[PDB]
Amino acid sequence: MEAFLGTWKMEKSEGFDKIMERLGVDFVTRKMGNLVKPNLIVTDLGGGKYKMRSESTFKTTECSFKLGEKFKEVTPDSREVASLITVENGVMKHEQDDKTKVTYIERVVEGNELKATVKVDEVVCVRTYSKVA
Numbered sequence: 001m002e003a004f005l006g007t008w009k010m011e012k013s014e015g016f017d018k019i020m021e022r023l024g025v026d027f028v029t030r031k032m033g034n035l036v037k038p039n040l041i042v043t044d045l046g047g048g049k050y051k052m053r054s055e056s057t058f059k060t061t062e063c064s065f066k067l068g069e070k071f072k073e074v075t076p077d078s079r080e081v082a083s084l085i086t087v088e089n090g091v092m093k094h095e096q097d098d099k100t101k102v103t104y105i106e107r108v109v110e111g112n113e114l115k116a117t118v119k120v121d122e123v124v125c126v127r128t129y130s131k132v133a
């Protein structure tokens with residue numbers, strides 16, 4: 001998790017519309033989701049716990065978790081999901097099961113850039129972030 005710590009600003013997004021469409025996100029929310037460019041703040045809480053916070057004009061969302069420990073998450077579009085985050089060969093692997101679809105998120109860091117790949121069924125989205133601090 002150490003590679004992911006800090007603040008990251010979203011620069012570009014591709015395919016997020018298609019992800020939201022597949023997940024059943026409603027029209028108004030999708031309009032918002034396609035516009036916003038969130039920050040992502042990843043913090044070490046000690047004791048193996050971490051927080052991810054996402055700030056945007058839509059809302060602030062966050063979650064605190066330990067690696068390899070299933071937890072309840074609410075997504076930004078207000079689905080209740082069962083989530084599980086691990087790190088494997090440098091890749092943060094974050095699954096979200098909403099009981100209809102499983103969303104697979106992979107985050108990777110190379111230098112100043114964090115790339116978040118989001119997959120639902122065959123749909124692929126990539127969101128690229130730059131390091132702020």
Ligand SMILES: CCCCCCCCCCCCCCCC(=O)O
Nearest residue numbers: 033036038056058075076077116127
């Ligand atoms: C901040 C905009 C929220 C818009 C609502 C979209 C809800 C779809 C949820 C997809 C799961 C979360 C994807 C996070 C990807 C990332 O870290 O950039």
